Structure formats: C-alpha cells, structure tokens
Design an enzyme around this catalytic site. Structure first.
Site, PDB file in Angstrom:
ATOM      1  N   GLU A  35       0.820  -1.200   0.000  1.00  0.00           N
ATOM      2  CA  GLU A  35       0.000   0.000   0.000  1.00  0.00           C
ATOM      3  C   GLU A  35       0.868   1.270   0.000  1.00  0.00           C
ATOM      4  O   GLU A  35       0.620   2.176  -0.736  1.00  0.00           O
ATOM      5  CB  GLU A  35      -0.948   0.004   1.212  1.00  0.00           C
ATOM      6  CG  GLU A  35      -2.070  -1.033   1.142  1.00  0.00           C
ATOM      7  CD  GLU A  35      -3.139  -0.761   0.104  1.00  0.00           C
ATOM      8  OE1 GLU A  35      -3.083   0.287  -0.573  1.00  0.00           O
ATOM      9  OE2 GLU A  35      -4.010  -1.649  -0.066  1.00  0.00           O
ATOM     10  N   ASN A  46      -7.782   8.969  -5.796  1.00  0.00           N
ATOM     11  CA  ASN A  46      -8.580   7.971  -6.501  1.00  0.00           C
ATOM     12  C   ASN A  46      -9.393   8.633  -7.621  1.00  0.00           C
ATOM     13  O   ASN A  46      -9.661   9.832  -7.596  1.00  0.00           O
ATOM     14  CB  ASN A  46      -9.499   7.200  -5.543  1.00  0.00           C
ATOM     15  CG  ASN A  46      -8.730   6.473  -4.445  1.00  0.00           C
ATOM     16  OD1 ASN A  46      -7.842   5.704  -4.757  1.00  0.00           O
ATOM     17  ND2 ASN A  46      -9.084   6.695  -3.151  1.00  0.00           N
ATOM     18  N   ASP A  48     -12.504   8.547  -8.279  1.00  0.00           N
ATOM     19  CA  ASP A  48     -13.724   9.150  -7.741  1.00  0.00           C
ATOM     20  C   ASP A  48     -13.550  10.457  -6.979  1.00  0.00           C
ATOM     21  O   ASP A  48     -14.528  11.036  -6.560  1.00  0.00           O
ATOM     22  CB  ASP A  48     -14.498   8.147  -6.877  1.00  0.00           C
ATOM     23  CG  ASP A  48     -13.842   7.855  -5.505  1.00  0.00           C
ATOM     24  OD1 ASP A  48     -12.806   8.426  -5.076  1.00  0.00           O
ATOM     25  OD2 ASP A  48     -14.409   6.999  -4.831  1.00  0.00           O
ATOM     26  N   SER A  50     -11.760  10.762  -4.134  1.00  0.00           N
ATOM     27  CA  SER A  50     -11.355  10.520  -2.773  1.00  0.00           C
ATOM     28  C   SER A  50      -9.810  10.359  -2.792  1.00  0.00           C
ATOM     29  O   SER A  50      -9.185  10.293  -3.859  1.00  0.00           O
ATOM     30  CB  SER A  50     -12.057   9.298  -2.192  1.00  0.00           C
ATOM     31  OG  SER A  50     -11.705   8.126  -2.914  1.00  0.00           O
ATOM     32  N   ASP A  52      -6.406   8.226  -0.656  1.00  0.00           N
ATOM     33  CA  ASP A  52      -5.909   7.231   0.298  1.00  0.00           C
ATOM     34  C   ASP A  52      -4.728   7.795   1.097  1.00  0.00           C
ATOM     35  O   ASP A  52      -3.887   8.457   0.513  1.00  0.00           O
ATOM     36  CB  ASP A  52      -5.437   5.985  -0.470  1.00  0.00           C
ATOM     37  CG  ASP A  52      -6.580   5.225  -1.159  1.00  0.00           C
ATOM     38  OD1 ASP A  52      -7.792   5.381  -0.886  1.00  0.00           O
ATOM     39  OD2 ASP A  52      -6.208   4.362  -1.942  1.00  0.00           O
ATOM     40  N   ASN A  59      -8.949   5.328   2.978  1.00  0.00           N
ATOM     41  CA  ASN A  59      -9.586   6.194   2.027  1.00  0.00           C
ATOM     42  C   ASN A  59     -10.579   7.212   2.629  1.00  0.00           C
ATOM     43  O   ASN A  59     -11.300   6.911   3.560  1.00  0.00           O
ATOM     44  CB  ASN A  59     -10.198   5.276   0.961  1.00  0.00           C
ATOM     45  CG  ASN A  59     -11.473   5.773   0.449  1.00  0.00           C
ATOM     46  OD1 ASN A  59     -11.528   6.413  -0.613  1.00  0.00           O
ATOM     47  ND2 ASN A  59     -12.543   5.499   1.205  1.00  0.00           N
TER      48      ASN A  59
END
Ligand SMILES: O=C1O[C@H]([C@@H](O)CO)C(O)=C1O
Ligand code: NA
EC number: 3.2.1.17
Length: 129
Positions: A35, A46, A48, A50, A52, A59
């Site tokens: 990650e 992201n 969309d 959002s 992380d 997120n």
C-alpha cells in the site's frame, strides 16, 4: 516516517494487530508494504475524487475527513492527516474498524492481490517480536 520492516512489525504487534480478526502479523506488514512502501506520508488520489492516506492507504470516501471528498463519510472520526503521522495509532485504530466491516482484509485491494494466499509470515521472518 518510513518504517523498517521489523520496526513496523513490532509497532503493529504492540498496537494489537497480530491475529486481529484472525489476520496474523505478516498480513498487516505485507499490506503496508504494497500500500505505502512502509511510508506514513503516502497519499494517492482515486478516480472518484477521494484520497488514500498513510501506511495502510485508508480512504477519504468512508473513513476520514480530508475537507475535499464531497458526500463521503468519516467513519473513523478523524482528519485524514492524522493517518500520515509517524505515530501509527490512528491508522491502526481505523484499520481495526475497517477489517471488522464485513470483508475482512479484502477491503485492501493490494492485500487481496499481493498478500492473500502467499507466505505472509516471510514479512516478519528474522524480526525480534
Ligand atoms: O472527506 C470529507 O470531505 C467532506 C467535506 O469535509 C468536504 O466536502 C466530508 O464530509 C468528508 O468526510
Ligand atoms: Na470523508
């Protein structure tokens, strides 16, 4: 902060992750590797809108408030920036809520694709724990 492998293992163990919801320590270390490369400051946007955050790439759509994810939740009740601290406490507490959410560690795409079904104990091999 960029953790050493064994350093993060020890920190995760001390924070109660080893066998948390039945996921042995190596699973968490493996997730964090893929990650964030063990970097508390990792952020990734992201599609969309959002973002992380942190060693486990938690997120903003569901789990933290970053001031810029319209119509999202803050289920861990924290500013996303708290997930970037060299103190992993917030990332750990929030991870525990996530892994309890129904899908277990499948919530972490990189766990499913890089760690699930592999010899995850390799990630804590040689560590003093
Ligand atoms: O991350 C978030 O962003 C929005 C808001 O703060 C800005 O639109 C919200 O309610 C979150 O939890
Ligand atoms: Na949010």
């Amino acid at each position: 902060k960029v953790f050493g492998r064994c350093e993060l293992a020890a920190a995760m163990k001390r924070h109660g992750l080893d066998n948390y919801r039945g996921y042995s320590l190596g699973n968490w270390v493996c997730a964090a590797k893929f990650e964030s490369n063990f970097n508390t400051q990792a952020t990734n946007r992201n599609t969309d809108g959002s973002t992380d955050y942190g060693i486990l790439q938690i997120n903003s759509r569901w789990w933290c408030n970053d001031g810029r994810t319209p119509g999202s939740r803050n289920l861990c009740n924290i500013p996303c920036s708290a997930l970037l601290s060299s103190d992993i406490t917030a990332s750990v507490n929030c991870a525990k809520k996530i892994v309890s959410d129904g899908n277990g560690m499948n919530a972490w795409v990189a766990w499913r694709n890089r760690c699930k079904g592999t010899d995850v104990q390799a990630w804590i091999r040689g560590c003093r724990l």
